[PDB]
């Protein structure tokens, strides 16, 4: 089965006396990646759509015209994706590629049917989608680990050692608006430091991390496990704690 749940956007004004049941009710998405199904979620802060597509037995295809009054889900929209599991395949109009760990796409504007396949159930590809609105068409782009040149800072001394790396961007593709961005926090660092949406992975299942939001006088936390997701409105603050290591993928859009 398929599943996008909409959320709306809220302002610091209301999110002001939030519970934290409330609080993780509207920026906290619990299940990314849940295995044979895709898991997306559509956010009201510009119109993003994103979650995990996680094919094991049978190929996968985000469905969607009359929810989004279009006839087929890209119609006016581009997306990003990143595999974050294991090795699968990507079939973007016919054309069927090898889509391994860490290998990502830009898809553009119109493309008609965009397939996600796994070559291994019992460890399968989880692609991580981030979907915006696109006026402009855009060349269809791979982008490998690789060609990346991970533009890394901070210190193990301000334990924020950590590598980024530029996926859909300007050093490597054009785009409208969307944004992506993998980022991993090396051994003995775990900090962070137009609306953002963030998905944490590849850490130990007892680590969790601090998710840290709000106008940045009025901060609060989401405490969160592996592979689940942050959705940081304009307004927001961006950063996060990490109990350990960990690794995220961070897509944005607006002006």
């Not at 985000?62 to 990143?82: A, M, T």
């Not at 008609?112 to 291994?120: D, G, I, L, Q, T």
């Not at 409105?233 to 290591?245: K, Y």
């Amino acid at each position: 089965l398929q599943n996008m749940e909409t959320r709306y956007t809220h302002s610091p004004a209301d999110i002001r006396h939030y519970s934290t049941e409330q609080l993780r009710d509207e920026f906290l998405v619990e299940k990314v990646f849940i295995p044979g199904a895709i898991s997306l979620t559509y956010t009201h802060n510009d119109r993003m759509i994103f979650g995990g597509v996680t094919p094991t037995t049978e190929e996968l295809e985000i469905i969607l015209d009359k929810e989004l009054g279009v006839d087929y889900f890209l119609e006016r929209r581009e997306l990003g994706v990143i595999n974050i599991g294991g090795p699968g395949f990507i079939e973007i109009d016919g054309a069927k590629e090898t889509m391994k760990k860490q290998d990502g796409y830009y898809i553009g504007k119109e493309t008609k049917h965009v397939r996600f396949s796994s070559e291994n159930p019992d460890n399968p590809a989880k692609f991580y989608i981030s979907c915006v609105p696109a006026h402009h068409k855009y060349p269809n782009v791979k982008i490998s680990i690789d060609e990346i040149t991970p533009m890394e800072t901070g210190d193990p001394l301000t334990l924020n050692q950590r590598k980024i790396y530029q996926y859909i961007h300007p050093n490597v593709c054009e785009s409208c608006q969307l944004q992506m961005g993998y980022t991993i926090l090396e051994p003995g660092s775990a900090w962070n430091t137009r609306m953002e949406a963030y998905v944490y992975f590849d850490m130990e299942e007892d680590t969790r991390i601090f998710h840290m939001m709000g106008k940045p006088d009025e901060t609060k936390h989401l405490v969160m496990s592996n592979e689940q997701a942050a959705i940081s409105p304009s307004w927001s603050i961006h950063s996060g704690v990490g109990t350990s290591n960990y690794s995220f993928i961070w897509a944005m859009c607006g002006e």
